[PDB]
Every structure is written in structure tokens, then in C-alpha cells.
């Protein structure tokens, strides 16, 4: 129930640069077990509480984990324009989701 997700919002970047995607679960003491980073079509990363960061091989060239629970995109294409999602797997509350819209311009 009680707890929200704040994000970096709707942002914009030049082609070829980097962006940081950050999220922050707040207003709850429930423990974060996993966080997934996803595009509208593909999952990009998973930070596990036990086992750590895995990065989807479709983005190994261009995606560093963090800082913190965020994620850094490296060589943005206009193809990267769209929605992004940090999904918070949590106990006891459940799945919290924050959303970011990115637009890569030329």
C-alpha cells in the first residue's frame, strides 16, 4: 500500500551520449529483494539482493549497473526513445514500479 517511487521523470538526450536512469523507493520499510530494468520490449538488467547485477547480453556493450540501484546507458540511439521501468520486488508489500520516458534527439 504505502510507499511511492520517484524517478528522473521524462528526460531528453543527444544521440551518442549517456544518460543515468535512477529510481528511489520511499515511504516503506519493506525489503527490496530484486530490481529489474526493462524497456517497453526488453529487459535490460537485474540487481539481485543475494547474487548481484546481471546485464542482459543484448546491452552488455552499452550498459553499466548503478550508480546505486540505477543504471547507465552508454551510446544512446533514437531507437532508445521510449518508456523504461524499474520494478521493485519487495517483502512484505509487493511489486513497486517506477517509470521514466526517454527521448533521444539529433
Amino acid at each position, epitope marked *: 500500500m504505502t510507499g511511492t517511487i520517484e524517478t528522473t521523470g521524462n528526460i531528453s538526450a543527444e544521440k551518442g551520449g549517456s544518460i543515468i536512469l535512477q529510481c528511489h523507493l520511499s515511504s516503506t520499510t519493506a525489503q527490496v529483494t530484486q530490481v529489474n530494468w526493462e524497456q517497453q*520490449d526488453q529487459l535490460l538488467a*537485474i540487481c539481485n539482493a543475494d*547474487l548481484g547485477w*546481471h546485464i542482459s547480453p543484448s546491452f552488455k556493450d552499452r550498459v553499466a549497473p548503478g550508480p546505486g540501484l540505477g543504471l547507465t546507458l552508454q551510446s544512446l540511439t533514437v531507437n532508445d526513445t521510449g518508456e523504461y521501468f524499474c520494478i521493485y520486488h519487495t517483502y512484505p508489500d509487493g511489486t513497486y514500479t517506477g517509470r521514466i520516458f526517454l527521448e533521444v534527439l539529433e
Partner: antibody
Amino acid sequence: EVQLVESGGGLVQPGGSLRLSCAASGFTFSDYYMYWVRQAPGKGLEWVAYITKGGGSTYYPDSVKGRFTISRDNAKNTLYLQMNSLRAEDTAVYYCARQTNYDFTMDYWGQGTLVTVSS
Amino acid sequence: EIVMTQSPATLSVSPGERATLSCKASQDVGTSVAWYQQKPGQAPRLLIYWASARHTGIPARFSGSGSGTEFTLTISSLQSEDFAVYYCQQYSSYPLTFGGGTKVEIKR
């Protein structure tokens, strides 16, 4: 119980074309990323095709790139492999596989269907 | 591409005993390494993901170790049913690549 059924295997002449089918059940086929993997008789396993949950992105190894085409129809609960310009060394049992939605690999494989490329 | 080499090719093990399998990646694959059991005539069955995490439905006598380039699957008290060819696989990057396998026979 997750179920994957492959279909379409048989003899085809070199240079020809064939099309394979995987029929899913027991899981929301549309949420899951899908693979094809192949295995020559007596030899090992070779990744051949990857596709996104909605079909937007596809990834192939150099071995088959530009000849195989992975695809899905989400309402048919079906994944397809279109094998063009076939070669002799393409002969293998072909498996479709489902990706873990908690990691980036394969949890469940079908039983396979066997392709044979010979004159 | 990332070559995964398993060793040894073959291992005969008395029942109740421990087999130890080895997968060696040609470059750092992190902990993106999975282990698969393929019984003759059967599809591969997933045993370990994330180099150490055991897939549900897998007995705890299977156990996965390693990070970096050196990975290790361990079957701590073999049973007749555990006879299969076991496969390792890295998913750090494309192309996803598999080991050559290690066949394991039951001793009697």
C-alpha cells in the same frame, strides 16, 4: 506444467528451405523471451536464435545470420524458425527454449524436431 | 566468441559418491553461467543459473560454484538417475555458447 512441442523436421535438399514450429502451453507465452537451440547427432549444443517477448528484436550467431529468421505469433502461442539456403552442416535436432524471467537463460526446452540436410 | 571448455570428458562414479565437473571460460563471463543435464534421448534440463542458484525442482545434492572464468558443478551423492551428459553455458554476451559437455556414468 510448461510444455513446448516442436514440429516441421524432415529431409530437405541442400539450398532448400524449411520452417519449424514450437507450440507452447501452460504459461503466458507472450510474457516470455524465446530461443532456438540446435544439436548435431552426437555433438553438443549451439545457440541459433533469440527473440524478444513481443518480437521487436531478434539476435542470431554469425553461423546462421542472414539465412534463419526467428519469429512468433503471440495469439497462436507459436514460435517459428524459417531456415533458408540450407547447408549440410545444418543437420541437427532443433529445440525451442523459454528464457527465465528471473535471469537471462533457458529453463524449459521442448523434446526437439530433427532436420536432415542431404542430397 | 567465448569458448567454454569442460573437463574431464568422462567421469564414472560409484553411487552415493561425489562427481565434480569443471567449466572454464575463455574470458570473464561474470556469473552468467548455467548448467544443464541432458539425459540420453531427452531435452536439456536446467540445473543451475547465475553460477550458483539452483532452479526450483532440482535436488540440493546439485550445487554450483564459481565466478569469472572458472566454474564448477558438483553432484554430492550420485544416483543411478543422475547419469547424463552435463552441459555448461555462458550468457554474458552473444553468441551464447555452451561447453562440450561431460558424460557421467554410474559405476557398478
